[PDB]
Amino acid sequence: IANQPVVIDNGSGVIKAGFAGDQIPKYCFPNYVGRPKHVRVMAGALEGDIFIGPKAEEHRGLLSIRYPMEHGIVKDWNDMERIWQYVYSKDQLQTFSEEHPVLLTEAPLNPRKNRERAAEVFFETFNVPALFISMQAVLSLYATGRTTGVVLDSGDGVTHAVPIYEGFAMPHSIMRIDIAGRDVSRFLRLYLRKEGYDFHSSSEFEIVKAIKERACYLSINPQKDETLETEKAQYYLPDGSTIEIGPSRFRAPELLFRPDLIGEESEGIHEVLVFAIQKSDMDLRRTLFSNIVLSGGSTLFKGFGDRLLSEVKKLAPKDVKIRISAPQERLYSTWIGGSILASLDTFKKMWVSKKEYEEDGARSIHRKTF
Amino acid sequence: EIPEISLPIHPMITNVAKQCYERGEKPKVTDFGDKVEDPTFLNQLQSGVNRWIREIQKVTKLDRDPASGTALQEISFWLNLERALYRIQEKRESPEVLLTLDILKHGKRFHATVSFDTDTGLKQALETVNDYNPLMKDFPLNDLLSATELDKIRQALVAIFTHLRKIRNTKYPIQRALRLVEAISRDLSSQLLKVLGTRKLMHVAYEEFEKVMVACFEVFQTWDDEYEKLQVLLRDIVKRKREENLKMVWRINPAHRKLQARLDQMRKFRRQHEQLRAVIVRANAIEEVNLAYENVKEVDGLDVSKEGTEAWEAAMKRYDERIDRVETRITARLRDQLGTA
Numbered sequence: 032i033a034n035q036p037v038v039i040d041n042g043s044g045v046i047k048a049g050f051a052g053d054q055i056p057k058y059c060f061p062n063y064v065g066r067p068k069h070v071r072v073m074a075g076a077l078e079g080d081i082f083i084g085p086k087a088e089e090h091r092g093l094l095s096i097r098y099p100m101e102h103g104i105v106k107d108w109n110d111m112e113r114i115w116q117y118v119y120s121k122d123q124l125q126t127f128s129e130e131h132p133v134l135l136t137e138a139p140l141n142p143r144k145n146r147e148r149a150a151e152v153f154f155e156t157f158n159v160p161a162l163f164i165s166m167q168a169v170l171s172l173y174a175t176g177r178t179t180g181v182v183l184d185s186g187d188g189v190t191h192a193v194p195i196y197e198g199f200a201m202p203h204s205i206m207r208i209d210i211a212g213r214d215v216s217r218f219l220r221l222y223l224r225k226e227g228y229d230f231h232s233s234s235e236f237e238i239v240k241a242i243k244e245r246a247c248y249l250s251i252n253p254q255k256d257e258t259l260e261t262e263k264a265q266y267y268l269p270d271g272s273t274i275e276i277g278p279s280r281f282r283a284p285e286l287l288f289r290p291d292l293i294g295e296e297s298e299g300i301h302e303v304l305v306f307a308i309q310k311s312d313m314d315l316r317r318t319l320f321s322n323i324v325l326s327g328g329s330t331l332f333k334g335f336g337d338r339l340l341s342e343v344k345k346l347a348p349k350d351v352k353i354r355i356s357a358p359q360e361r362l363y364s365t366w367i368g369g370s371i372l373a374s375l376d377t378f379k380k381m382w383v384s385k386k387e388y389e390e391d392g393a394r395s396i397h398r399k400t401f
Numbered sequence: 402e403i404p405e406i407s408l409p410i411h412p413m414i415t416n417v418a419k420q421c422y423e424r425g426e427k428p429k430v431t432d433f434g435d436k437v438e439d440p441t442f443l444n445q446l447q448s449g450v451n452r453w454i455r456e457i458q459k460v461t462k463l464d465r466d467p468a469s470g471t472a473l474q475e476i477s478f479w480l481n482l483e484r485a486l487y488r489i490q491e492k493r494e495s496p497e498v499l500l501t502l503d504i505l506k507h508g509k510r511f512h513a514t515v516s517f518d519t520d521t522g523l524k525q526a527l528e529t530v531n532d533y534n535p536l537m538k539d540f541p542l543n544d545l546l547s548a549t550e551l552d553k554i555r556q557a558l559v560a561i562f563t564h565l566r567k568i569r570n571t572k573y574p575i576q577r578a579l580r581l582v583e584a585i586s587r588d589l590s591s592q593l594l595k596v597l598g599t600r601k602l603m604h605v606a607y608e609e610f611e612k613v614m615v616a617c618f619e620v621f622q623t624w625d626d627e628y629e630k631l632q633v634l635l636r637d638i639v640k641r642k643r644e645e646n647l648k649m650v651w652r653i654n655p656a657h658r659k660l661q662a663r664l665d666q667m668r669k670f671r672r673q674h675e676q677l678r679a680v681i682v683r684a685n686a687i688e689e690v691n692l693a694y695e696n697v698k699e700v701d702g703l704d705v706s707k708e709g710t711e712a713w714e715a716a717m718k719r720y721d722e723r724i725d726r727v728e729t730r731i732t733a734r735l736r737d738q739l740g741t742a
C-alpha cells in the first residue's frame with residue numbers, strides 16, 4: 032500500500048513525470064545535467080553546483096550541459112540519481128519516494144543492467160514501495176485507446192517499432208535502430224558547420240536543438256528538392272545574430288530515412304516499420320498496416336507523416352490500406368499511457384513489491400518484466 | 402475487549418466544514434476549488450485514507466483461539482465483534498469521510514476510493530457478522546448459569562442445543578463447533594463442581610445419594626443422546642455443503658467424563674459396601690470392617706481428580722486390601738464355623 036503511483040517517463044532527452052490518473056504530465060524538463068564552467072568569484076553567486084530543470088535552462092550560459100542517458104541507456108548513474116532526486120524535489124513533486132509506487136517507462140532491447148541498476152536505485156536509495164518497468168509502445172497504444180497495431184516512435188536517443196497484438200507486444204518483431212532526435216541534431220550541427228556557422232559548445236548544442244525544433248522540415252521528394260536553391264530563411268539566435276540556413280534544413284532530418292549520411296548500415300524509419308510488420312504473422316499484416324501510431328518528439332517535423340506514407344507505400348505490397356495515425360500528444364503518449372495503465376486495479380498485481388525485490392532480487396524483475 | 406479507533410481527517414478540511422457549519426451549508430466538494438486538483442493536497446488525502454484502511458484492517462481480521470477463555474468469553478467475543486464492526490460501518494458512513502472520498506473521486510484518483518471498500522475487509526466481515534448475528538443474539542447460557550438442580554440442567558442442555566440447531570443455515574465450522582462443545586462441557590463441569598460442593602454428598606445416606614447419582618447419569622445421558630443428534634446434524638450439514646474430505650477429529654474428550662469415570666469406580670465401590678454393610682450386621686468382623694471401612698475412606702477431600710489418582714489410587718486399592726485383610730479371617734473362619742461339625 033502507498034499513496035498513488037508516480038509515472039516517471041524517462042527519455043534520453045526529455046524526462047516527463049507526474050502522478051497516475053493525471054491528464055497531462057505536469058512536470059516535464061530536459062534530461063540533462065548542467066554544472067558551471069566558469070569560476071565563482073563574487074559572493075552571493077548562484078549557490079550550488081549541479082543544476083537541473085528550469086534553473087539549469089535559465090542560466091544556460093554558465094553550464095556545461097551533459098547527458099547521462101544516451102540511446103536509452105544510462106551512461107552515468109550519479110547524474111541520473113540527481114535527476115530522479117530532482118523529480119522528487121520541492122520544485123517538481125514535493126513528495127517522498129517512500130509512499131509512491133513507481134511506473135517506469137523504458138525502451139525495448141536495452142541491456143539487463145539498466146533494469147537491474149535502475150531497480151537498485153529506486154528500491155534502495157529511493158526505497159519506493161513498488162517499481163514497475165515497462166515498454167513504451169504498449170503505453171502509447173494504451174494512450175490512443177485502440178489495441179492492435181504497430182507503434183512507431185522516435186524519441187531523443189532511440190527509435191523502434193513494436194507490433195502490438197491486443198497488449199501482447201510481439202517480442203520477435205521489434206526492430207530498433209539508434210538514430211533519433213539528438214542524433215539528428217548532431218548531424219544538423221555538422222551541416223551548420225559546413226554552412227559556415229559554428230556551434231560547438233555544450234550549451235550551444237542546445238541552440239542547435241532549438242533550430243531543429245523550429246526551422247527544419249521534411250522534403251517530399253528527397254532529391255528533387257536538393258537540386259534546387261530554397262528561399263534560405265533566416266534564424267534569430269538568443270544572442271541576436273542571424274543565420275541563413277539554406278539546404279541544411281531538409282537534409283538534416285533526412286538522416287532518419289537514410290542513415291548513410293551518418294555512415295551507418297542501419298535502416299530508415301520506413302524500413303523499421305516494414306521490417307517490423309513483415310517479421311510477424313502473415314495473418315496480421317493487413318491489420319497492422321491499417322493501424323500505425325506515431326509517438327515521440329522526432330515525429331513532429333513538417334511533412335513527416337506524409338513522407339512516411341510515401342515511403343511505406345513504396346515498401347508495402349500493392350493495394351493494402353496503409354493508415355498512419357498521428358495524435359496530438361506524441362510527446363506525451365507514453366506518459367498518458369502510463370497514467371491509464373497505472374490507474375487500474377490490476378496494477379496492484381502488476382508491479383513488483385519491495386518485499387519481493389528484497390527476497391528474490393533482480394531476477395524477480397526479469398521474471399515479472401511484463 | 403475490542404479497539405474502536407476513530408478515523409482522523411486533515412485539519413484544514415475540518416476548518417472548511419467548520420466555516421460551512423457556521424452558516425448551515427453543506428460543505429461541498431468544490432469548496433477547495435483550485436486546491437482539489439493539486440498534488441500535495443491529494444497526497445495528504447490518500448495518506449489519511451490509507452491509514453484509515455489500516456485502522457479498519459487492524460480489527461476486522463482479528464482472531465483468537467476459539468477455546469481460549471471460558472465459553473461465555475468466546476461467545477461474548479463474537480458478539481463484541483458484531484457490534485464493533487457495525488460501529489466501524491458507522492465511522493465509514495459519516496458525511497465527512499464521504500467528503501474526503503468525494504475529494505479523491507472528483508480529483509480522478511480512484512485508488513483510495515475503490516480500496517476504501519475493497520481493500521478494507523469490512524464488507525466481508527460485516528456479511529459474516531450478519532450471518533452469525535441472530536445466532537449470537539438471545540443465547541440461553543443464563544439457563545446454564547443459575548442451574549444447580551440436575552433437572553434444570555437437563556432441560557437447559559436440551560434448550561441450548563435446540564437453539565444452537567440454527568447452525569445448519571449459517572455455515573458453522575467443524576473445529577469451531579468442537580471447541581464450542583468442549584467449552585459447553587467446561588461450564589457444565591464448573592457448575593457440577595460447585596454442585597458437588599453445596600451437596601455435602603460425603604455424609605448423606607444411600608437413598609438421597611442414589612437419587613443424586615441417578616440424576617447425574619440423567620444429565621450425562623441427555624448429553625450423550627442429544628450430542629449424537631447434534632453429531633448427525635453436523636454430518637448432514639457437511640453433506641449439504643460438499644466441501645472436502647478433511648481429517649475432522651470427533652474423538653472428543655470433554656470436561657465431564659473426567660468426573661464420570663470416578664463415579665463409576667464409586668458405583669462398584671458402593672457394591673462392595675452394599676453387600677457388606679447391608680448384610681454384615683447379621684465375630685467382630687462386622688464392626689471391624691465398618692471400622693477399617695470408614696478409616697480408609699473418610700478423606701476424599703472435595704474429590705478432585707488430580708489428587709484422586711495421585712494418592713487415592715493407592716488409598717483406593719488400599720481400601721480394597723483393608724477389606725480383604727480384614728475380611729481374610731472370615732473365609733477360613735467360615736471354614737472353621739461350619740467345617741468342624
Ligand SMILES: Nc1ncnc2c1ncn2[C@@H]1O[C@H](COP(=O)(O)OP(=O)(O)O)[C@@H](O)[C@H]1O
Pocket residue numbers: 040041042043044045046185186187188212213240243244245327328329330331332362
Ligand atoms: N517540434 C519538433 N520537431 C522535431 N523534433 C523535436 C520537436 N520537438 C522535440 N523534438 C525532439 O524530440 C525529442 C523528444 O522526444 P522524447 O520525448 O525525448 O522521447 P523520449 O522521452 O521517449 O526520449 C527531443 O529530444 C527533441 O529533440
